[PDB]
């Protein structure tokens, strides 16, 4: 259960969380569930010049529904806001060059070894946790190594 957005929310300042709430609280005004139903999302969408069908709308809810409620709550809304939040621009080309800087032995696989040395090269006091962790996410095959493709999938959306 590790996502690039979950960290997004967590780093939201109290100043940010506070304003998103007033936005949310105004967003669900009129709702009996006190949450975002298609009724609410279509309203705001229409304020934004768009008239989605009830389907496409509920579909956007699902995009973030975690409880099968078929609606959006404040925490789910917070996620939604950071997803559309980043104007994040890195190219598979940039990452491909970085890949090669991880593969100290040039085998075409960032392995458990090089990962630690690498993760170590960065001023952060690394623990066996960070190591155990980082390799887990990247290791889509967990074949002890991290190949090109999943390295891309790995750094996808990273500053």
């Amino acid at each position: 259960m590790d996502d690039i957005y979950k960290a997004a929310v967590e780093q939201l300042t109290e100043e940010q969380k506070n304003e998103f709430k007033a936005a949310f609280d105004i967003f669900v005004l009129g709702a009996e569930d006190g949450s975002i139903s298609t009724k609410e999302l279509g309203k705001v969408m229409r304020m934004l010049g768009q008239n989605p069908t009830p389907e496409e709308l509920q579909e956007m809810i699902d995009e973030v529904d975690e409880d099968g409620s078929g609606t959006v709550d404040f925490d789910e809304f917070l996620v939604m806001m950071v997803r559309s939040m980043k104007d994040d621009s890195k190219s598979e080309e940039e990452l491909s060059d970085l890949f090669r800087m991880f593969d100290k032995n040039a085998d075409g696989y960032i392995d458990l070894e090089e990962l630690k040395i690498m993760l170590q090269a960065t001023g952060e006091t690394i623990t066996e946790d960070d190591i155990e962790e980082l390799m887990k996410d990247g290791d889509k095959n967990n074949d002890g190594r991290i190949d090109y493709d999943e390295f891309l999938e790995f750094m996808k959306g990273v500053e």
């Binding site: 491909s96 090669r100 040039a106 075409g108 696989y109 190949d147 090109y148 493709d149």
Partner: protein
């Protein structure tokens, strides 16, 4: 040497003679400098081409795995 080979040899010598022989001791020194530079620049393109060749070798190799593991 085959008549074809002497001809390669001669015409190569003739290129030297046509470019160098009429120069005086001063135009000479400057010619040497010109040729030197040309070599240097050619030698520099070679080194960039050599470095890129190595990188392509690794890129071709990574593409090997990527195609293996699929």
């Amino acid at each position: 040497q085959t008549e074809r080979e002497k001809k390669k040899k001669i015409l190569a010598e003739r290129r030297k003679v046509l470019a160098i022989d009429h120069l005086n001791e001063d135009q000479l020194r400057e010619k040497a400098k010109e040729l030197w530079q040309t070599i240097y620049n050619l030698e520099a393109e070679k080194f960039d081409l050599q470095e890129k060749f190595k990188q392509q070798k690794y890129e071709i190799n990574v593409l090997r795995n990527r195609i293996n593991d699929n």
